[PDB]
């Protein structure tokens, strides 16, 4: 029973660590959207002014 | 954007300046080609002899 309890402790640490990696990867994925949407808006306004 | 708007604006002034300068030189050539005669050499050849 104590060996199974030790295995359960290790299992939840591996699960939490796997979710931690996924949380950070979703943040990296989100950062690229924030930066590229700013680029397209800024370049579009630059063309708006250039045509005028 | 803004800097490039100023980049184009000054380039247009220079394109005009390049044509106006050619016309001003042509104008001076046509004016001198009619305003100069024997009465000018006594004021130019005489000037060079001191230079």
Swiss-Prot record, chain B:
Coiled coil: none annotated. It comes from the Bacteria. It is found in: Cell inner membrane. Belongs to the ATPase B chain family. F-type ATPases have 2 components, F(1) - the catalytic core - and F(0) - the membrane proton channel. F(1) has five subunits: alpha(3), beta(3), gamma(1), delta(1), epsilon(1). F(0) has three main subunits: a(1), b(2) and c(10-14). The alpha and beta chains form an alternating ring which encloses part of the gamma chain. F(1) is attached to F(0) by a central stalk formed by the gamma and epsilon chains, while a peripheral stalk is formed by the delta and b chains. F(1)F(0) ATP synthase produces ATP from ADP in the presence of a proton or sodium gradient. F-type ATPases consist of two structural domains, F(1) containing the extramembraneous catalytic core and F(0) containing the membrane proton channel, linked together by a central stalk and a peripheral stalk. During catalysis, ATP synthesis in the catalytic domain of F(1) is coupled via a rotary mechanism of the central stalk subunits to proton translocation. This is ATP synthase subunit b. It comes from Pseudomonas aeruginosa (strain UCBPP-PA14). The lineage of its organism: Bacteria, Pseudomonadati, Pseudomonadota, Gammaproteobacteria, Pseudomonadales.
């Amino acid at each position: 029973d104590l060996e199974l309890a030790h295995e359960k402790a290790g299992q939840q640490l591996r699960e939490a660590k796997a979710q931690a990696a996924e949380i950070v990867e979703q943040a990296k994925k989100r950062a690229n959207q924030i930066v590229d949407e700013a680029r397209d808006q800024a370049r579009t306004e630059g063309e708006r002014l250039k045509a005028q | 954007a803004q800097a490039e708007i100023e980049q184009e604006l000054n380039s247009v002034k220079d394109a005009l300046r390049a044509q106006v300068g050619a016309l001003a030189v042509t104008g001076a050539e046509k004016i001198l080609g009619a305003s100069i005669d024997a009465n000018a050499h006594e004021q130019l050849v005489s000037k060079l002899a001191a230079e």
